[PDB]
């Protein structure tokens, strides 16, 4: 709106030209055929009323050059001076320019010739107002639609009765005045009085009578003391009452259109009726008969929140209705805390409002569930029921909690009959819905299983590693721990936090063991390993191969991971460390075992022979080793299962540069 | 089981009953014919228009109208010639016959005497043979031609273009009409059938209106007999009945009895007809029951009055405008349903520049689970700070993304017009909505959500892969507001990587059919990543099967070093097991494993018989040794 | 009993059964008409029903990612596919398309799971009739499903 | 919640408001209001 000269179609003071013109195009329409039948040129009386009347038309249409248009393909208005001129020309300015001629100046101004008066008809090119008006009405539910349907056919039924009794006292005065015996109004006698000379009969006798006939035609009663007698108005009441037995058909069927479809409430007073009807066929009792109306009547007037009736608004304003309702009876449920917020979204656009009386059944006990309710309003009870029709109130299920759930998680039947005490405002959620988006936000289900054990302190169910809901969440754990293993064996670091923040677990294990924490520290990413510590992890976890994260870091051979997990718990707990530790002496890598004792294992554990890694070592001369080997043990005097200490061992070997080692611990006793 | 439903299947049989033989049988559906055809209805509406003008208002037709209705009898005299040379479309067997013996018989024992008569001059007979009254009445035998007009009402029943509630009143208005003509013809017949000196007891005779008196009824011109007679019968078949012109007879009283009867029903079908049409609601107040139905459920939940305009918007959009018809078409199953996405999708999800020539299997997948959606101007479909449920492509329109700095500076970031996407940059990432995506005009946008465009994005990893190439060939989004992200998800290897570990991992848990459905699409290795493992280092021994049918497929290579020296016998023959380590070694097994002497020493200090005779009965030779070259005896003999 | 007991008992599915087994299922079947060309399972997909041809030439396809399938078989009249992902609680292996006017009969998996489960005996037959005829390649045990429980 | 269920609800609560007081006012379904209301009906 960057001209300021351009007025908007739903201007306040354009709304009130629209209601002044509509006035004066049910005058102007109304008097058209009144100016064409009872006169032949106007009066000096009604000179200044239709000069008057063609200049309210005439700046209408000036007035239509500068009104903005709603476009059809993009919903946006108009304010182009261009476009709306455009669009006035092609669509209706002809027919509103040449109809506001003044046609009887020029009927008196061209020696008064009769075929220049019935270009005086396209000024009926101005009930197209009235008919926007009732376009206009019908799209708007202010107003009733039995005061829209039926009054826009009591309208035409006043203009094809008004106009035909025009054009009726019109073809009268087509014949000369000579011939009046042989008209329908000069040859008329009413009563003692005669309708002759019927010229100078004054305006309103004649449109009275003329308009009596044709309202007493078209409501077909017909008395008959005013008919045709010629040949023309033969021809005229033959279509005119062709036209109205059509229009009279139309009247009565859109009449019995709008009566056979009745609101809503004839038709549950018509279910009422005959439910009615049968309570008391059946001799029904008094508290029944009035739960059975009171459940009807509260389903009547609570089934409006269907959801069917929004099932072509699109998403994210579904969504966002489901979001402004249900939301915050969801986020206060002890079930779902802890859940993110695409769960919770997941979850309220899929519930079902529902509301029951004081004293109706939700669940039953022998039965497995098939909705998950939820609890807004209302202090329904869980009654456990025996055989022997006793009842236990175990559980008062009031507001902001929910029933059904250990019974489709775990897919066990309803532990308890569950009654409703108020008038409750539950939630329904089937279980389709609720095991497809637990095993498509496993994240979440996991949170909700770690939720529904705690509460019952798992009464029982406990592995419940028996639903699938409990074993897709298990597969899909399994493959996101696979899958944040990879993550962590190469440098993929911002990778693996992007999988760990996504909400996973750095604690599950691959199919063999191999934590994060493992394969972090056998391809010594530092950083990796430092935030798996700063986050939280096991780090004496063991494998299928019984191995920790600091025997591959020391496998591995980076000494940075190797202080790095030290200064932790780090705690080798090796099983056959003396056989591994006299494997390493037999392989001699002398650096492996630098890494080895460096801070973990005691070097004077045993293998099946009971004897010492030293005494492997003294054994075929392995000094530098040796050396390496006895900096951190003790206790020399060890014999094996022979009966050998080490030092008579290594005077054996043939190679004495390594007995200048024996001569250390001798001071230790 | 097509011989039960002839009307379901077998539609239209064409190509072996066309041009049998004969030559001359015309299908009737030439457009040489459907010329002739509305022709032969122009003369028989004029032809049985004129049958009861020529009965009532005349006897014996005069010197004029001579040529006209001999002319009339030839152009029906062709048509009755003619029919022996057009096919027979058929009720039960739907094929068109072309037997010249089945053209003339059907038609021999139908509307042919009855056609043939009418083609007979019935005003030269009269003529010569005495001028006898009763061979007139041989004229309403031409009243056999309204069949044509009554074919015409049936070929436009089937016509899907009109309603047929509306040809079926149609039908009765031509009905209504050509009975008050045929009324009146009748009603002027029967006050010429009593002589010229008692014609002041007739209808007519009598008749006297304004001051016109119709007196010596028979010179009067034709036009004003027949004016006079027709307007007394439509009259009286509206039911005004002014009682100017009346019955004055028996035989005219007994003719208005019964029509005044048969009108009766006419107009009662007639306003049963237009109610029938009428209760098929129109657009506006099928408009109407649901926004009422909407209104409330407005009114009693409290929406916003910003919300509430929405959702007026949009009902008002699907009705008045844009037929979105999905509610009708969900009763189509879910293949032809995919037959009509694929046809209307495809041309514009196949230009969309995210899916820079992936796999036809790939857009299929796509175009399959996708909603059209339409959004008035001023919507915000995804604000920027919030989660993506939904992927958008934009068919038709035009949208803007927006951001803001710190004080709602909404400038505009691009302007995705047709052909665009939005809402890609962050199911791709995990990350939130960086753009409040408004609309500018009124748009068409395809909807796919995320869970979909999660499943088929991790199915189809090699198009995953493109469509994240697709990402970063770009000006890595600065054209956008040069929110980089990593290099998006980087490579991330679904090659090797994952997929080595997906399908080991499906080999773990046992099962068979995701095994096989990943490895009969390529892509089976000997090696995982992070460890030395094979899909037979986990499933055969380990896992021990689950499923016999893990061993036998592809034959993957035995006695793999793994990173912990384990071959796939010994993985098999440690958690004893004894189906793999009798399968295995026939298929070439090994026990080869460094230090063999230890660990077997190992395993006699632990003390375990059926380790051991595994170990040795699927194959070691107890001669290998130690450091201190002592064998599993020298253990054995220990302790 | 006589518009659907001879199709249901010339089914190599029901072989051995006792008839009273025959007449609890044949009541809760579902007439359903297929014309040749549209899908009614998918690639994976544990089936919602059980189906028993009565005159119709099905093709059971499995498709693959690029597109392809092969028809691992041929279901002509008197066959029963469903049933073993249904008793065994895996999913259907099987796209089945169809490629004549098939006149097909369905049963839910709810009402065909109380069935076998109140009259074991002859869903003891069915577990033998199916663990011969599908040869059982695996799963003799498969107690993945709680039918066999 | 309750509140917005009026009509539809309990709806049997004469009994404590029949004659608190002023012991003239005639109840609508009375025998002797409907020999007024058929009498003066017919007139
Ligand atoms: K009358």
């Not at chain 1, 072509?312 to 209705?321: E, F, G």
Request: glycine share 6%; charged share 25%; proline share 3%.
């Amino acid at each position: 709106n960057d001209y300021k000269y351009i007025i908007h179609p739903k201007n306040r003071w354009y709304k009130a030209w629209e209601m002044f013109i509509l006035v004066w195009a049910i005058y102007s329409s109304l008097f058209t055929p009144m100016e064409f039948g009872f006169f032949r040129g106007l009066p000096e009386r009604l000179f200044v009323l239709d000069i008057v009347g063609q200049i309210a038309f005439l700046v209408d249409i000036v007035l239509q050059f500068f009104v903005a248009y709603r476009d059809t393909q993009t919903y946006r208005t108009v304010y182009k001076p261009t476009r709306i001129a455009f669009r006035y020309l092609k669509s209706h300015f002809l027919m509103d320019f040449i109809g506001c001629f003044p046609w009887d100046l020029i009927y008196k101004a061209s020696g008064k010739h009769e075929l220049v008066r019935y270009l005086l008809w396209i000024r009926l090119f101005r009930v197209r107002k009235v008919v926007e008006f009732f376009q206009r009405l019908e799209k708007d539910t202010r107003i009733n639609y039995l005061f829209t349907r039926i009054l826009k056919l009591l309208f035409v039924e006043v203009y094809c009765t008004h106009t035909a009794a025009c054009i009726f006292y019109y073809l009268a005065t087509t014949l000369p005045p000579e011939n009046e015996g042989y008209t329908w109004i000069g040859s008329l006698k009413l009563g003692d009085y005669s309708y002759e000379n019927f010229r100078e009969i004054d305006l309103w006798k004649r449109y009275t009578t003329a308009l009596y006939f044709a309202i007493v035609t078209m409501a077909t009663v017909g008395y008959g003391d005013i008919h045709a007698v010629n040949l023309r108005e033969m021809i005229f009441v033959m279509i005119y009452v062709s036209f109205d037995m059509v229009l009279g058909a139309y009247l009565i069927g859109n009449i019995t259109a709008l009566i056979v479809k009745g609101s809503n409430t004839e038709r549950f007073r018509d279910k009422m009726n005959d439910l009615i009807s049968f309570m008391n066929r059946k001799k029904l009792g008094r508290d029944l008969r009035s739960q059975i109306t009171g459940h009807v009547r509260l389903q009547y007037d609570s089934h409006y929140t269907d959801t069917v009736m929004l099932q072509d608004i699109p998403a994210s304003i579904r969504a966002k209705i489901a979001q402004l309702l249900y939301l915050p009876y969801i986020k206060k449920v002890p079930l779902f805390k802890g859940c993110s917020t695409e769960f919770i979204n997941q979850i309220v656009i899929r519930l079902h409002e529902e509301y029951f009386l004081p004293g109706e059944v939700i669940t039953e006990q022998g039965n497995v569930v098939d909705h998950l309710y939820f609890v807004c309003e209302g202090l329904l009870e869980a009654l456990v029921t025996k055989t022997d029709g006793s009842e236990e109130s175990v559980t008062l299920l009031g507001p902001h909690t929910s029933f059904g759930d250990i019974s489709i998680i775990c897919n066990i039947s309803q532990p308890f009959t569950v009654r409703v005490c108020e008038l409750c405002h539950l939630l329904r959620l089937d279980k389709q819905s609720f095991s497809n988006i637990l095993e498509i936000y496993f994240h979440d289900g996991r949170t909700i299983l770690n939720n529904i054990m705690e509460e019952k302190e798992s009464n029982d169910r406990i592995k419940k590693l028996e639903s699938d809901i409990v074993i897709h969440i298990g597969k899909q754990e399994a493959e996101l721990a696979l899958k944040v293993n990879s993550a962590a064996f190469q440098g993929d670091f911002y990778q693996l936090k992007s999988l760990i923040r996504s909400g996973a677990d750095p604690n599950k294990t691959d199919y063999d063991g191999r934590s994060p924490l493992h394969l972090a520290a056998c391809r010594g990413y530092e950083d990796i390993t430092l935030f798996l510590i700063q986050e939280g992890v096991d780090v004496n976890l063991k494998d299928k191969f019984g191995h920790t994260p600091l025997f591959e870091a020391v496998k591995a051979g980076q000494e940075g991971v190797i202080g790095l997990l030290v200064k932790e718990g780090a705690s080798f707990n090796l099983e056959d460390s003396g056989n591994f530790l006299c494997t390493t002496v037999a392989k001699g890598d002398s650096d492996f075992l630098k890494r080895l004792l460096s801070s973990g294992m005691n070097p004077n554990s045993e293998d099946y022979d009971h004897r010492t890694p030293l005494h492997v070592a003294a054994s075929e001369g392995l000094f530098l080793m040796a050396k390496m080997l006895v900096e951190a043990g003790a206790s020399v005097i060890s014999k094996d299962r022979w009966g050998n200490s080490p030092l008579d061992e290594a005077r054996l070997c043939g190679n004495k540069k390594l007995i200048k080692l024996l001569e250390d611990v001798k001071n230790a006793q | 089981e097509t011989f039960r439903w002839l009307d379901s299947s077998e539609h239209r049989r064409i190509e072996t009953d066309g041009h049998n033989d004969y030559k001359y049988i015309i299908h009737p559906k030439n457009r040489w014919y459907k010329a002739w055809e509305m022709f032969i209805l122009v003369w028989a509406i004029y032809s049985s228009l004129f049958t009861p003008m020529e009965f009532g208002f005349f006897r014996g037709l005069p010197e004029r109208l001579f040529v006209l209705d001999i002319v009339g009898q030839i152009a029906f005299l062709v048509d009755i010639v003619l029919q022996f040379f057009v096919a027979y479309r058929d009720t039960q067997t739907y094929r068109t016959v072309y037997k010249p013996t089945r053209i003339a018989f059907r038609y021999l024992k139908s509307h042919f005497l009855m056609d043939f008569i009418g083609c007979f001059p019935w005003d030269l007979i009269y003529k010569a043979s005495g001028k006898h009254e009763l061979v007139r009445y041989l004229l309403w035998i031409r009243l056999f031609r309204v069949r044509k007009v009554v074919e015409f009402f049936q070929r436009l029943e089937k016509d899907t273009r009109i309603n047929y509630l509306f040809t079926r009143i149609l039908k009765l208005l031509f009905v209504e009409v050509y009975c008050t003509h045929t009324a009146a013809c009748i009603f002027y017949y029967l006050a010429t059938t009593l002589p010229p000196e008692n014609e002041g007891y007739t209808w007519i005779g009598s008749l006297k209106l304004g001051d016109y008196s119709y007196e010596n009824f028979r010179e009067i011109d034709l036009w004003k007999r027949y004016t006079t007679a027709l307007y007394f019968a439509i009259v009286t078949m509206a039911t005004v009945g002014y009682g100017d012109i009346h019955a004055v007879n028996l035989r005219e009283m007994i003719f208005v009895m019964i029509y005044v009867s048969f009108d009766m029903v006419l107009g009662a079908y007639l306003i049963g007809n237009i109610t029938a049409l009428i209760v098929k609601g129109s657009n506006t107040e099928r408009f109407r029951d649901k926004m009422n139905d909407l209104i409330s459920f407005m009114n009693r939940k409290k929406l916003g009055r910003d919300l509430r305009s929405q959702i007026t918007g949009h009902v008002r959009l699907q009705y008045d405008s844009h037929y979105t018809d999905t509610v009708m078409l969900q009763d189509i199953p879910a293949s032809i349903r995919a037959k009509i996405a694929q046809l209307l999708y495809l041309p514009y999800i196949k230009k969309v520049p995210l899916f820079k020539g992936c796999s036809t299997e790939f857009i299929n997948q796509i175009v399959i689970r996708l909603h059209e959606e339409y959004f008035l101007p001023g919507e915000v479909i995804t604000e920027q700070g919030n989660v993506v449920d939904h992927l958008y492509f934009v068919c038709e329109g035009l949208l803007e993304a927006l951001v803001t700095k710190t004080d709602g500076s909404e400038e505009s970031v691009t302007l995705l017009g047709p052909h665009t996407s939005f809402g890609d940059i962050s199911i791709i990432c995990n990350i939130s909505q960086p753009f409040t995506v408004r609309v500018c005009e009124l748009c068409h946008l395809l909807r796919l959500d995320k869970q979909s465009f999660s499943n088929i994005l991790e199915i189809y990893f090699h198009d995953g892969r493109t469509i994240l190439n697709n990402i970063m060939e770009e000006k890595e989004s600065n054209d956008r507001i040069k929110k980089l992200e990593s290099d998006i998800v980087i490579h991330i290897g679904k090659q090797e990587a994952e997929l080595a570990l997906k399908v080991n991992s499906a080999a773990f848990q046992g099962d068979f059919y995701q095994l096989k459905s990943l490895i009969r699409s390529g892509a089976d290795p000997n090696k995982t990543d992070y460890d030395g493992r094979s899909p037979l280092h986990l499933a055969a021994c380990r896992g021990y099967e689950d499923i016999t049918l893990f061993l036998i497929q592809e034959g993957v290579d035995v006695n793999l070093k793994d990173k912990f020296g384990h071959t796939p016998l010994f993985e098999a023959v440690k958690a004893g097991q004894e189906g793999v380590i009798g399968l295995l070694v026939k298929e070439g097994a090994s026990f080869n494993l460094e230090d063999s002497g230890n660990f077997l020493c190992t395993t006699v200090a632990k003390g375990d018989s059926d380790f051991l005779k595994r170990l040795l009965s699927s194959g070691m030779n107890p001669n290998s040794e130690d450091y201190d070259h002592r064998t599993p005896l020298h253990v054995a003999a220990s302790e």
